[PDB]
Each structure stands twice: as C-alpha cells, then as structure tokens.
Structure 1
C-alpha cells in the first residue's frame, strides 16, 4: 500500500476521484472504496514487478517518490478507457519510465522518512575466498 485514498484525493482532488470511481450513479455521489483499493493494488503490483530485482518486496516503509508513482498509476488505472493522447496516459508513461530507470540502476530509491531502503543481496555473492598461507601462521 504505497498510496491511500487520502493521497489520491490530495493529488487529484476529491471531485475527480468521485467522478472516475462512481460507476453506478449518474451524476456521481460517493467514492467507491473497493474500486480505488483495486486500482492502488494494481499500481503496487506493477511497481513491485519493476522493483523486485533490486530491493526486498515487503517494504517496511514507502519512499515519497514511490508514493507519487503509485498515485499516478492508480489514477491511470481508474479509467476504463484510456486513449494514447490522454494526458493522464502520458503521466503514467513518464512514471513507468522513472520505474524502469530505477530498475536499470540509473536512479536510486530515495529516503523513506530518514533511513535508506533495503537493497537485496544480489551483488553481495562471492564464492568464499580460499587464502590459506596468509593467516599469520
């Protein structure tokens, strides 16, 4: 859960979330929590797809850039039909580009609140090191 309904409302205003989330009432009246939850879950799943090879999956903290990316992807997911030239689609593409840059080691995952994220041990591995005759015998 890198973003919440509060984050979506704050980033896109409550009116737009209501309009793109209420599918049964015309005009919209309330925000459907289930739809928003599914959209946020899908955004988190995509982000994990991008970040699985460099960091641990169950992150204990959410970096701020991760919050922005999740909010953007979740909003893009709340559109049933999304054309290519829709600006929301372009924002989603830019965020996906940021994610790909992070995955390819060109961008670093920033601070969460004060501490660093938790990188995986992929680079750590070395055989073991056989150096007998060099132990001050």
Structure 2
C-alpha cells in the first residue's frame, strides 16, 4: 500500500477512524486490519489508474500519492453513508487520476530528491535501418 494506517489516522482523526472501523471487525472492538485492507484497495485503485504509463512497482513514489491513497481509502471506508464532501473529494481525486492516466498531469516527484517515476515507452516506432541518411559521411 502507498500509505500506512499511521498516516490515515493522522490526516483523519483517529477517533473517527475507530468509529468507522469498530463495526466492520468481527469482535466489535477497534481494529487495525480493516484500515490496512481499505488502504490496500485504494492503492490497487491508484495502481490501476497509473499503470497506463508507468512501471507499476514504482521506483520512486510521488509524494502526493499518499494523499491520493488516504482520500480514496477514506471514501471506501464510508461506503454505507458518506458525507457530501467525502464524495466530492473522491470525485476530485478520481478526476485527477483520470488526468494522470490520460497524460494531462504528471503525478509529481519524490519531494526528497525530486525524482520522477519511470515507465514504459508510451510511443515507440521502428523503421528499416537508415541508408543514405546525412550521418553517412561517405559520398557527399
């Protein structure tokens, strides 16, 4: 997963996270595996939206992707009855992921070293070996 539960419980108040999680567990006591599973599902969502033009086991993780995983995990964790703002922000992050997939916006870099994640060649052409090109310094 892109973001750990210790970050989702920091961006979103831990008490509200416990309130959301405690029903979903089998026993009925505050649990941590539910949040990790939701974060894994959100990371899978982002991975699917990024694999279009990136090598998906990201060499360097864009620093905004932690936020983009936390928001989607929060929406996935409020599926029974979400606030209007949660839905609006989830639609905004889906729009951002669609723009990233299409090519309108790059995901960003790692804020530590400003390195952008690599990916496979979106465009690739092959032609026959070049003959009579200007690089052939013979003749002329």
TM-score interval, smaller chain = 0.7 to 0.9
1:21-57 deviation per Cα after TM superposition (whole angstroms, max 9, x unaligned):
11168xx753x22111110111011111111111111
Instruction: Provide the aligned length of Structure 1 versus Structure 2.
Output: 132
1:38 paired with 2:47, answer no
1:102-137 deviation per Cα after TM superposition (whole angstroms, max 9, x unaligned):
1111111211131111132122x1214522234223
**CA contact 2:3–2:69 (8 Å) conserved in 1:** yes
User: Which deviates further from its counterpart, 108-117 or 11-20?
Assistant: 108-117
Could you say which residue in structure 1 is the equivalent of 2:16?
16
Q: Which has the larger radius of gyration?
A: 2
- SS of the counterpart of 1:64? coil
Could you say which residue in structure 2 is the equivalent of 1:136?
137
Runs ≥4 residues deviating over 3 A: none
- SS of the counterpart of 1:56? coil
Q: Where does structure 1 lack aligned partners over 5 or more consecutive residues?
A: none
TM-score, normalised relative to structure 1 = 0.85
1:48 paired with 2:44, answer no
CA RMSD of aligned residues (A): 2.0
TM-score, normalised relative to structure 2 = 0.84
Q: Where does structure 2 lack aligned partners over 5 or more consecutive residues?
A: none
What is the 5 A alignment of 1:1-137?
A: 1-23=1-23, 30=30, 32-82=31-81, 86-112=84-110, 113-114=112-113, 115-123=115-123, 125-134=124-133, 135-137=136-138
CA deviation after TM superposition for structure 1 residue 12, in Å? 0.4
**CA contact 1:4–1:40 (8 Å) conserved in 2:** yes
Separation in 2 of the partners of 1:98 and 1:91?
10
1:54-81 deviation per Cα after TM superposition (whole angstroms, max 9, x unaligned):
1111113321211111000011111241
